[PDB]
């Protein structure tokens, strides 16, 4: 229950931040005037072409590193080494 | 493979039908090979229709560029194919189109 | 006409991305004449391309004819070349086009890229008149996609991918070779004269690697041996071409029957004077064999010669 509650609270921070971003400056008791009167950040981030290319290159490098690290971890596991050793020993014996 | 003295496209078609990518790698894509113009794109289309990931990868490794290959008509053909595992696309298209689809209706990119 | 061509400022340089292979590789290129002074090229490489001076300079030569060599030897060759280039800080000089030995070094780069994240500075110096798509490269300081796939019908060849940089040599002729060799040799000699970070007073070491080859490879190795600072030459015995005649002449020498090769105009023509002048300085020659030689690795053989 504690772990699930922590995860749900962390998830629900986002809606609180959005709600207080989309709200008037004044509080309810004195937004009476503001009712009759009626995103550079906080929601998005507008980027230029050169910085967009930089972000794309960074993402490509990250995904390449992720795949390389995953392959390196898999190839050096005990199970894979045992399997390969057994196959090579069988072929060598034959 | 050598039993017909056929062109490399037909050997590639046979290897695609048999789903043996090692044979095509070791017997069809060899040093000094000759390829006609536009045959590899047709091979890529056939491999995409039949859901042959290994053959798609091998064709990409051998000079096929997806930027030049993919057009609107090819994508519409890919969406209107039958040579693959069953999916639930037609039900969604019927639901979005208010269930007024005539028989053998052709799906357009607008519907997608 | 003795190169009746004008001299206009450079029109084709920038960056290219290769489309068609299984990799995503970017290469920097410039189209320049064959009279460019090596100091200007060094300035371009060290400042515009931002390349640190190398501690080693491998200059691979061979036969431009698209050949094939025995398996279990191309793997050893690739492993040794990649290890020698990666462990040290080295620049590799090749032809650049995708034919012959350059195709094999491209394969060696390709198989190593999957297993390791190291970056190797491979520099291709090719004539401008043989690139299959001379267009699609004119965009100054802008990326230009390039098609790795080629049709065998055209006599032109495509620049090999997996090369980090390109220098395109121009003289005025198109569809002809022999317009980049002098610039390559002059740049190599100029780089060798540069002072490495050590304060002993020694310059950058230069070694030459030979695979396959032909008639002009003998002249190249002669000019390397006859250079004012001698350049060690590593030869591969199992290649088959005139490198193999060098390997054979390296054995039980200081027998003209074994010297006869029939390779160039049968027994009527013999490059015997050139071969014997090369074999006079057999201490700088390091023939690599996978058998009796103590150095079974080309990587160990390359560094030991220096």
From Swiss-Prot, chain A:
It is found in: Cell membrane. It comes from the Eukaryota. Disruption phenotype: Trpm3-deficient mice exhibit clear deficits in their avoidance to noxious heat. Trpm3-deficient mice display reduced hypersensitivity to thermal, but not to mechanical, stimuli in carrageen-induced inflammatory pain. In the chronic constriction injury (CCI) model of neuropathic pain, intraperitoneal injection of isosakuranetin or primidone do not reduced heat sensitivity in Trpm3-deficient mice. Homotetramer. Interacts with TRPM1; the interaction results in the formation of a heteromultimeric cation channel complex that are functionally different from the homomeric channels. Constitutively active, non-selective divalent cation-conducting channel that is permeable to Ca(2+), Mn(2+), and Mg(2+), with a high permeability for Ca(2+). However, can be enhanced by increasing temperature and by ligands, including the endogenous neurosteroid pregnenolone sulfate and sphingosine-1 and suppressed by intracellular Mg(2+). Implicated in a variety of cellular processes, including insulin/peptide secretion, vascular constriction and dilation, noxious heat sensing, inflammatory and spontaneous pain sensitivity. Belongs to the transient receptor (TC 1.A.4) family. LTrpC subfamily. TRPM3 sub-subfamily. This is Transient receptor potential cation channel subfamily M member 3. It comes from Mus musculus (Mouse). The chain holds residues 1144 to 1255 of 1732 of the full protein.
From Swiss-Prot, chain B:
Disruption phenotype: Trpm3-deficient mice exhibit clear deficits in their avoidance to noxious heat. Trpm3-deficient mice display reduced hypersensitivity to thermal, but not to mechanical, stimuli in carrageen-induced inflammatory pain. In the chronic constriction injury (CCI) model of neuropathic pain, intraperitoneal injection of isosakuranetin or primidone do not reduced heat sensitivity in Trpm3-deficient mice. Signal peptide: none annotated. Coiled coil: none annotated. It is found in: Cell membrane. Constitutively active, non-selective divalent cation-conducting channel that is permeable to Ca(2+), Mn(2+), and Mg(2+), with a high permeability for Ca(2+). However, can be enhanced by increasing temperature and by ligands, including the endogenous neurosteroid pregnenolone sulfate and sphingosine-1 and suppressed by intracellular Mg(2+). Implicated in a variety of cellular processes, including insulin/peptide secretion, vascular constriction and dilation, noxious heat sensing, inflammatory and spontaneous pain sensitivity. Homotetramer. Interacts with TRPM1; the interaction results in the formation of a heteromultimeric cation channel complex that are functionally different from the homomeric channels. Belongs to the transient receptor (TC 1.A.4) family. LTrpC subfamily. TRPM3 sub-subfamily. This is Transient receptor potential cation channel subfamily M member 3. It comes from Mus musculus. The gene is Trpm3. The chain holds residues 472 to 583 of 1732 of the full protein.
From Swiss-Prot, chain C:
Changing residue 79 to A/P/G: Reduces calmodulin-binding by more than 50%. It is found in: Cell membrane. Residues 66-89, 174-197 are annotated as: Calmodulin-binding. Disruption phenotype: Trpm3-deficient mice exhibit clear deficits in their avoidance to noxious heat. Trpm3-deficient mice display reduced hypersensitivity to thermal, but not to mechanical, stimuli in carrageen-induced inflammatory pain. In the chronic constriction injury (CCI) model of neuropathic pain, intraperitoneal injection of isosakuranetin or primidone do not reduced heat sensitivity in Trpm3-deficient mice. Homotetramer. Interacts with TRPM1; the interaction results in the formation of a heteromultimeric cation channel complex that are functionally different from the homomeric channels. Constitutively active, non-selective divalent cation-conducting channel that is permeable to Ca(2+), Mn(2+), and Mg(2+), with a high permeability for Ca(2+). However, can be enhanced by increasing temperature and by ligands, including the endogenous neurosteroid pregnenolone sulfate and sphingosine-1 and suppressed by intracellular Mg(2+). Implicated in a variety of cellular processes, including insulin/peptide secretion, vascular constriction and dilation, noxious heat sensing, inflammatory and spontaneous pain sensitivity. Belongs to the transient receptor (TC 1.A.4) family. LTrpC subfamily. TRPM3 sub-subfamily. This is Transient receptor potential cation channel subfamily M member 3. The gene is Trpm3.
